[PDB]
């Protein structure tokens, strides 16, 4: 069974209880905080260099190593549901500009091609994955992903050290493969809903 938090008070309670056990060092905490300030400064270079840490500028490499090292301390204590909102660029360059009709609705014909590319297949990203324990904040995004993450999987609640407290952010490792088990158009026809699974 996967736990889904429906209320901020309960979500903060859970997250804080786990965060207290991490014992992240000061350099680990500073590298994660730097990431939260603007994830693009880390995920950008990682995409640019196709995950090859040796190509990163020395200062970014150092932050990547500390964040990577921090996941030795951060594991999910139970099966849990996490959320991420995305823009059309997430689907790739061949879809970015065709997936939405002029009126903001999802193009049903192109969506069939998106399914063909992604549905029941794995995908791996070069960047770390930022999610939230709650979905509310992603309500107006064109793509919302619900990640089902199993107990024991790497990942941590970092809200207490985030630059932007209250986002209820859970950070997942980079180069992290997930399986897309479902994709649907939402009832209002203006959103794509993706279900993805992570087991490590």
XYZ file of N, CA and C in Angstrom, residues 84-91 96 99-101 104-106 111 137-145 183-186 188-194:
108
model
N 5.149 15.601 -8.844
C 5.990 16.608 -9.496
C 5.167 17.272 -10.593
N 5.273 18.580 -10.751
C 4.609 19.217 -11.887
C 5.614 19.521 -12.987
N 5.182 19.451 -14.236
C 6.110 19.722 -15.325
C 5.452 20.521 -16.436
N 6.297 21.135 -17.249
C 5.862 21.775 -18.504
C 6.042 20.805 -19.684
N 5.507 21.147 -20.842
C 5.597 20.277 -22.035
C 6.986 19.869 -22.473
N 8.004 20.653 -22.115
C 9.363 20.311 -22.471
C 9.746 18.945 -21.928
N 9.101 18.527 -20.839
C 9.374 17.229 -20.231
C 9.208 16.078 -21.225
N 8.302 16.243 -22.174
C 7.995 15.169 -23.153
C 9.015 15.105 -24.290
N 7.071 18.935 -27.437
C 6.964 20.195 -26.703
C 5.970 21.159 -27.322
N 1.942 19.141 -28.349
C 1.064 18.419 -27.424
C -0.166 19.239 -26.973
N -0.005 20.567 -26.929
C -1.100 21.447 -26.507
C -1.730 22.094 -27.734
N -3.054 22.024 -27.852
C -3.775 22.805 -28.867
C -3.678 24.290 -28.536
N -5.249 25.407 -25.270
C -4.706 24.919 -24.013
C -5.102 23.485 -23.718
N -5.979 22.908 -24.540
C -6.361 21.507 -24.344
C -5.295 20.570 -24.923
N -5.273 19.340 -24.426
C -4.287 18.366 -24.885
C -4.734 17.828 -26.261
N -1.232 12.889 -28.466
C -1.121 12.157 -27.199
C -0.944 10.656 -27.462
N -0.111 22.053 -5.165
C 0.625 23.139 -5.763
C 0.857 22.950 -7.258
N 0.561 21.760 -7.774
C 0.811 21.480 -9.186
C -0.472 21.473 -10.005
N -1.557 21.925 -9.383
C -2.879 21.869 -9.974
C -3.054 22.574 -11.298
N -2.260 23.593 -11.573
C -2.378 24.243 -12.865
C -1.261 23.961 -13.852
N -0.452 22.924 -13.590
C 0.641 22.565 -14.490
C 0.071 21.668 -15.594
N 0.640 21.724 -16.798
C 0.147 20.888 -17.902
C 0.438 19.390 -17.714
N 1.492 19.053 -16.974
C 1.811 17.633 -16.724
C 2.017 17.434 -15.232
N 1.366 16.440 -14.658
C 1.589 16.120 -13.246
C 1.945 14.654 -13.168
N 3.043 14.367 -12.482
C 3.467 12.997 -12.310
C 3.272 12.581 -10.858
N -0.651 6.713 -18.255
C -0.710 8.126 -18.677
C -2.118 8.387 -19.142
N -2.701 9.469 -18.651
C -4.084 9.796 -19.002
C -4.247 11.277 -19.199
N -5.257 11.645 -19.984
C -5.653 13.047 -20.044
C -6.642 13.281 -18.906
N -6.501 14.405 -18.220
C -7.371 14.688 -17.081
C -8.783 15.013 -17.567
N -10.582 17.620 -17.252
C -10.788 18.939 -17.847
C -10.118 19.102 -19.215
N -9.425 18.051 -19.664
C -8.743 18.062 -20.967
C -7.560 19.001 -21.081
N -7.024 19.456 -19.953
C -5.967 20.444 -20.017
C -4.701 19.957 -19.308
N -4.716 18.715 -18.863
C -3.569 18.200 -18.117
C -3.283 16.757 -18.504
N -2.007 16.387 -18.524
C -1.633 14.992 -18.639
C -1.216 14.497 -17.252
N -1.773 13.368 -16.856
C -1.435 12.737 -15.582
C -0.633 11.476 -15.813
N 0.571 11.448 -15.246
C 1.470 10.313 -15.384
C 1.641 9.606 -14.059
